[PDB]
Structure formats: C-alpha cells, structure tokens
Amino acid sequence: LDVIRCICGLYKDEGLMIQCDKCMVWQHCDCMGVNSDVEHYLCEQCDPRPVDREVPMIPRPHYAQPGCVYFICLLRDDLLLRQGDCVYLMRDSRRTPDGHPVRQSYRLLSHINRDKLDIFRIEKLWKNEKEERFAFGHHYFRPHETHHSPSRRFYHNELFRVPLYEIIPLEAVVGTCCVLDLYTYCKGRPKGVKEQDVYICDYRLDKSAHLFYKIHRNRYPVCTKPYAFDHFPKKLTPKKDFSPHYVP
Amino acid sequence: PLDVIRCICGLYKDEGLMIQCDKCMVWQHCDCMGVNSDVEHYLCEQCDPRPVDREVPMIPRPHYAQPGCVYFICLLRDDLLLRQGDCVYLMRDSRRTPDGHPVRQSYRLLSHINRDKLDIFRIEKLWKNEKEERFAFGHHYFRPHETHHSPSRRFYHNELFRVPLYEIIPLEAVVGTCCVLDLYTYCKGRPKGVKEQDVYICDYRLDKSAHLFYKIHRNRYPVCTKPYAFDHFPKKLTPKKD
Ligand SMILES: [Sr+2]
Ligand SMILES: [Zn+2]
Ligand SMILES: [Zn+2]
Ligand SMILES: [Zn+2]
Ligand SMILES: [Zn+2]
C-alpha cells in the first residue's frame, strides 16, 4: 500500500526514504539516522531502539541564525508538533494594549474549552540559542471575529485565514486541531483526529477583516491515502446555519 | 576528498571541470556529459536517463595529430570501454596482407583465452580514422623470459617490464583489460573490479634491446586510491621474488 510511518508523522514522499524489512513501512532517511545506500533496515517498532523525536531540517535553511536550529517537528513535553500542524493556543493575557502578545503555559489552563482558544497554523519550528522551543505561523479567525452583515451565515466549525503572523513559545500550545477545505471535510477525516477538532476554511480575510476571499490552493494538503485518511461512506452535506450575531 | 566521481569514462580524475548530481551526489566531468560547469540543476545519466555517448573526444585536439583522425579519451570495443592509460591484453594471432606487415586479428576469433599467450600493452592514444575504424597507440610490456637478464636475477611471478616499443593496433585486437601496478601499490590494495589473475607488477623499464634495467620513479598513470575506487588490504602484502 506504500505505507509511510515515520517518527516525524509526515507523509511527504519528498527526498530519500527507506523501507522496513518486516512491516514494510517507509521512513525518511533524514529523520532516522541512516543512508539510502543501506541494503537492510528495520524501523524503531520492529527493531526497538532510542529515537530522537525532534528532527532538524536536514537541508539547513539559509535564513537560519547561528545558535538557532530549525526543526520539522518538536516535542511539547509529550505532544509532537509538526510544520503545517494546526493547534489550539492559550489566550493573550496582556493588559497593555501596545505590548507584545503574552501567552502563558498550557499547564495553567483550568478546564479545556477549545472554543475559548485561538486556532493557529504552525509554519516553522525552531530551538533558539538557549534551546527554547518556538513556533511561527498565522492565525485563523472565528466567525465572531469577522466583520460581516447580520444576514451572513457560517458553518459552526468555519474559520478564516488571516495575514496575522506571530512567534509563540511552544508551551503556549494546548493541543492539535485539523483545518480542512469543505470538499476534504465532506469526504473523510485524517486518522487520529477528533470530530470536535475538525474545522472548515475556504476563505481568507484582508487586514480589515471585512473582505472574504476564496482560497485557491491549500498550503498544507493532507494525505488522502487509506492508512492516513478515513473516508466517509457518503460525502457530508453540512449546513451553513450558524450566526455569530444571533446566538442564545 | 569525500568526492565520489562516477562518470561515463570510468576515470577518477578530479581534473577538468566537474558537475555534481543533485540526487546521488556523484561528480561527473562536464566534458564527458556535454554540459556547462554552471548548470543550476544537474542530474546524472542514472538519475535522469537520457541518450549518452560513451565515446568522448579529446576536446583540446592534440598538435601533431594524424590527418583525418579524430582523437578520443575513451572508445568502445563492442561493449568494452577502453580509456587512455588502460593496460590491455592483445591478440598475438596475426595476418599478413600486402608486404610483410603483420596485423593482429579480432578477439572474436579466440575460443579459449590464455593470458600468457597474449601481449600486455599500455594504451596512450585512441582515435577513429576517416572510415570510423577505431585504433589505439602505445607500448608493450615485456615478460621476464623476454628480457635479456643475468642468470642470477630474480623476478616476481607477475612482474612485467616497460619497453619503448610502440605500435598502432586495431581496437579489435584487445581481448580485455589488466592492471599494471608498482610494488607499493600492488602491496597496498586493488582497484575495484579487477581479477588478481589480471594484476601485474612493473617497477622497471628496459631499452629497445631489453638488456638494461632502469627503475621507474614517476608513474605516468597514478591510480586513484580513494575507497570508492580502491579496496585497501588491511595488511600490506609481502611478495617474494623467485
Ligand atoms: Sr547544483
Ligand atoms: Zn520523517
Ligand atoms: Zn517495521
Ligand atoms: Zn568523464
Ligand atoms: Zn545521480
């Protein structure tokens, strides 16, 4: 089936890869510490061995500052985060309106209401000169955060891409979520994602957040193969019956 | 260097303009692959299959070249690529035609191959004539029994002697390649792919008479000892002359 089960948890078939001699899963040569010239190989499940779950960008980027190392995936304690992952973020706690957004540790959160957390797309991960983990990416706006006509209706799980970028400490990540296009949302669900953490986004906003532009190319496409994606028996037909203005 | 050189010529010279394959990381002569030295995206013939010509001409055509002759770095003898510097087995079976002129026959005629019943020859030049007939130029190696030596003189079992006896040969007269090394190299290791039976030692040259023996100081064709090209013996060999 050409199954990819790497430690990084990404399905990209870009670059050198290596197959296991027992379970037949493909893994990135860069993520594991192995050449493509090796004639025999076993994965970390078939051949249990220490694995560093934090994988550096092996083509080290040019924009990399000395002392800092860019990563394709990092660990937030026990939770693995990857480039292209959507996450829930702790709120901005600043009482100074001019100050930088201060987002506290996830460990301080009392009870998890995901609707009260900011949703964010990780574009970059890196360890700094002090080995502190950071992420860079853009925000997704919830429907109530947008300027719209009272007539406008949304999906209850609809979000909107916004050209608002931020550097965050990795501790500010509460958990992962899944942001799909409508078509993909209707077809199936990526393996190991909760129904309650699946959102729809087809539109981006301008800076005023009054203008709604259709997204043409999804920047981070999901693997649709059966080992990675659970196809629904029938395509969903969700309803745009949610209004931020008119809520109980 | 950690430079792996794998070109269609099969030579290991880091000399000349080189280009690296962005997939396998091997280096190839720009001059053999028909590419400029500064091509942003390069892939070799194995990573990006395409028609190649293994018969690579000498881009600086040599002065004093024979008229109507195109010179080459490497030429194909059927399926065997032969290169400048190669040591080869040569057919002894020959034919006369107009005058005395004996000419060595094709290797296709040979049924059973005996190494000792062939001549060892070093190829220096390779060319195609006007009719695209392939030829090689170079000098012979002499076996010990072919040398006029003092009765007391001892030899290695595979010892050969360089002689200034040059000949134009039709490429068809080549039976196969062998490997001629100095003692030091012979003792250190083997080039990849070579049979021991095709490995010989030469440290001395003779005169046209083959009575006088002179030690060679400068190897005309030094062999690449890089691990990708050369397997090193874990311990130096200890051959004894008798
Ligand atoms: Sr290049
Ligand atoms: Zn990987
Ligand atoms: Zn396995
Ligand atoms: Zn070449
Ligand atoms: Zn290549």
Residue numbers in the entry:
A (entry chain A): 2583 to 2830
B (entry chain B): 2582 to 2823
From the paper:
The histone H3K36-specific methyltransferase ASH1L plays a critical role in development and is frequently dysregulated in human diseases, particularly cancer. ASH1L itself functions as a specific methyltransferase: it methylates lysine 36 of histone H3 producing mono- and di-methylated epigenetic marks H3K36me1/214,15. There is no information available about the N-terminal 2,000 amino acids of ASH1L, though several domains have been identified in the C-terminal part, which contains the catalytic SET (Su(var), E(z), Trithorax) domain, followed by a bromodomain (BD), a plant homeodomain (PHD) finger and a bromo-adjacent homology (BAH) domain. We find that ASH1LPHD recognizes H3K4me2/3, whereas the neighboring ASH1LBD and ASH1LBAH have DNA binding activities.
To elucidate the interplay, we determined a 2.4 Å crystal structure of ASH1LPHD-BAH. The considerable size of this interface suggests that ASH1LPHD supports the BAH fold and may explain as to why we were unable to produce an isolated folded ASH1LBAH. A large network of inter-domain hydrogen bonding, hydrophobic, and electrostatic contacts stabilize the ASH1LPHD-BAH structure. The side chain amino group of K2807 is hydrogen bonded to the side chain carboxyl group of D2595, whereas the side chain hydroxyl moiety of Y2809 makes a hydrogen bond with the backbone amino group of I2586.Overlay of the crystal structures of ASH1LPHD-BAH and H3K4me3-bound ASH1LPHD showed that the ASH1LPHD fold superimposes very well and the H3K4me3 binding site of ASH1LPHD is not occluded by ASH1LBAH. In agreement, binding affinity of ASH1LPHD-BAH for H3K4me3, was similar to the binding affinity of ASH1LPHD for the same H3K4me3 peptide. The electrostatic surface potential of the ASH1LPHD-BAH structure showed a large positively charged surface of ASH1LBAH positioned next to the negatively charged H3K4me3-binding site of ASH1PHD and thus suggested that ASH1LBAH might bind DNA. Binding to unmodified 147 bp NCP was decreased, pointing to the contribution of the interaction of ASH1LPHD in ASH1LPHD-BAH with H3K4me3, whereas binding to unmodified 187 bp NCP was increased compared to its binding to unmodified 147 bp NCP, indicating that ASH1LBAH in ASH1LPHD-BAH prefers extra-nucleosomal linker DNA, and this preference was retained in ASH1LBD-PHD-BAH.
